[PDB]
Scaffold this active site. Structure first.
Site, mmCIF file in Angstrom:
data_model
loop_
_atom_site.group_PDB
_atom_site.id
_atom_site.type_symbol
_atom_site.label_atom_id
_atom_site.label_comp_id
_atom_site.label_asym_id
_atom_site.label_seq_id
_atom_site.Cartn_x
_atom_site.Cartn_y
_atom_site.Cartn_z
ATOM 1 N N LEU A 280 8.172 14.766 -13.013
ATOM 2 C CA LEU A 280 7.665 16.124 -13.215
ATOM 3 C C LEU A 280 8.359 17.107 -12.275
ATOM 4 O O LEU A 280 8.846 16.745 -11.226
ATOM 5 C CB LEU A 280 6.166 16.167 -12.978
ATOM 6 C CG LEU A 280 5.210 16.083 -14.183
ATOM 7 C CD1 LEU A 280 5.797 15.620 -15.494
ATOM 8 C CD2 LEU A 280 4.008 15.232 -13.853
ATOM 9 N N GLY A 281 8.401 18.366 -12.679
ATOM 10 C CA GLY A 281 8.734 19.445 -11.769
ATOM 11 C C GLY A 281 10.218 19.719 -11.835
ATOM 12 O O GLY A 281 11.008 18.854 -12.234
ATOM 13 N N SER A 282 10.634 20.904 -11.424
ATOM 14 C CA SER A 282 12.018 21.279 -11.687
ATOM 15 C C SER A 282 12.935 21.335 -10.471
ATOM 16 O O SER A 282 14.064 21.826 -10.591
ATOM 17 C CB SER A 282 12.060 22.614 -12.433
ATOM 18 O OG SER A 282 11.444 23.622 -11.638
ATOM 19 N N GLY A 283 12.486 20.840 -9.316
ATOM 20 C CA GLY A 283 13.303 20.952 -8.106
ATOM 21 C C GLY A 283 12.499 20.501 -6.891
ATOM 22 O O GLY A 283 11.387 20.054 -7.033
ATOM 23 N N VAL B 209 7.103 13.219 -8.366
ATOM 24 C CA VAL B 209 5.838 13.068 -9.104
ATOM 25 C C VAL B 209 6.174 12.785 -10.531
ATOM 26 O O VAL B 209 6.919 13.580 -11.114
ATOM 27 C CB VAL B 209 4.998 14.399 -9.112
ATOM 28 C CG1 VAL B 209 3.670 14.196 -9.861
ATOM 29 C CG2 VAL B 209 4.793 14.927 -7.681
ATOM 30 N N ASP C 169 -2.128 25.729 1.991
ATOM 31 C CA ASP C 169 -0.914 26.050 1.218
ATOM 32 C C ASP C 169 -1.322 26.567 -0.153
ATOM 33 O O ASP C 169 -0.777 26.208 -1.176
ATOM 34 C CB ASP C 169 -0.064 24.767 1.101
ATOM 35 C CG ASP C 169 1.346 25.035 0.646
ATOM 36 O OD1 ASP C 169 1.809 26.159 0.865
ATOM 37 O OD2 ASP C 169 2.004 24.108 0.060
#
Ligand SMILES: O=c1[nH]c(CN2CC[C@H](O)C2)nc2c1sc1ccc(Cl)cc12
Length: 275
Positions: free
Chosen positions: A12-15, A20, A135
């Site tokens: 997952l996720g772009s960077g 994950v 955060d």
């Protein structure tokens, strides 16, 4: 034990440097997120109710898991020689608030009010459970695009909540208050409220207000989009330079701009198009 009770999917996720994976619980097909955490970069360990030495993140997840859907739930965790592996709930379809804002720009007040309110409920629920997130920001908020429910994620910089001063911080700088920037100290609640002001401005203007240390310390807010006066006043209230001039959760929620919030369901039908 073992990794045959999940089927691993794509990353997952772009960077970023985290890992994950989208997963699916073999036992019942429940969609889940599989988050791998490296021992080397855990700076904070805690110990569990039954007293084992785990990442602070796990201690905090376990303390906020339970019926309330405003925080992603930790469903299980496993340790490995070099990392811990965390199994968390995954809504489907889902999109983080950062992408959603990338796609749709500044949000109508009505949608911001409803998102913002669910964020307040989630953070109240963490505080209430003895946990400080530290955060809060649009990347750490998931949108369950079908039910219109937001979910707070990623306790990896969090701490047990306490009433005395914090002198360490590891979250996102541009969301951190002026007392941290200048003195390397803050208190939990008031710091969190500052990050809530940054977040609300982000939502209604489509970007955060400050990038550089000086603008944070200066605390002056310019609005680049049309935004009602009541909403601008809430934001400037959250971003008072002095911690004791920030509102509590309770005053933020009794603010005139917070009245008549949409339910999640209505929010998704109206703004997410459900049906
Ligand atoms: O604890 C997390 N962290 C991250 C990673 N990131 C680092 C970048 C952003 O801060 C957040 N993703 C997730 C979690 S729980 C969770 C549950 C569902 C889905 Cl779909 C993604 C996630």
């Amino acid at each position: 034990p073992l990794e045959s009770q999940y089927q691993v999917g794509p990353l997952l996720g772009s960077g970023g440097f985290g890992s994950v994976y989208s997963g699916i619980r073999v036992s019942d097909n429940l969609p889940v997120a599989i988050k791998h955490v490296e021992k080397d970069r855990i700076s904070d360990w805690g110990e569990l109710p039954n007293g084992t030495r785990v990442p602070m993140e796990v201690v905090l997840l376990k303390k906020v898991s339970s019926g309330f859907s405003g925080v992603i739930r930790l469903l299980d965790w496993f340790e490995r020689p070099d990392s811990f592996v965390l199994i968390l709930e995954r809504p489907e379809p889902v999109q983080d608030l950062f992408d959603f804002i990338t796609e749709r720009g500044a949000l109508q007040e009505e949608l911001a009010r409803s998102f913002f309110w669910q964020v307040l409920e989630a953070v109240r629920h963490c505080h209430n459970c003895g946990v400080l997130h530290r955060d809060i920001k649009d990347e750490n908020i998931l949108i369950d695009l079908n039910r219109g429910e937001l979910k707070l994620i990623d306790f990896g910089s969090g701490a047990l909540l306490k009433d005395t001063v914090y002198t360490d911080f590891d979250g996102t700088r541009v969301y951190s208050p002026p007392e941290w920037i200048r003195y390397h100290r803050y208190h939990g609640r008031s710091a969190a409220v500052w990050s809530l002001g940054i977040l609300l401005y982000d939502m209604v203007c489509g970007d955060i207000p400050f990038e550089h240390d000086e603008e944070i310390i200066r605390g002056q807010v310019f609005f680049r989009q049309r935004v009602s006066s009541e909403c601008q006043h809430l934001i400037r209230w959250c971003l008072a330079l002095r911690p004791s001039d920030r509102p509590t959760f309770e005053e933020i929620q009794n603010h005139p701009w917070m009245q008549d919030v949409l339910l999640p369901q209505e929010t998704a039908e109206i703004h997410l198009h459900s049906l």
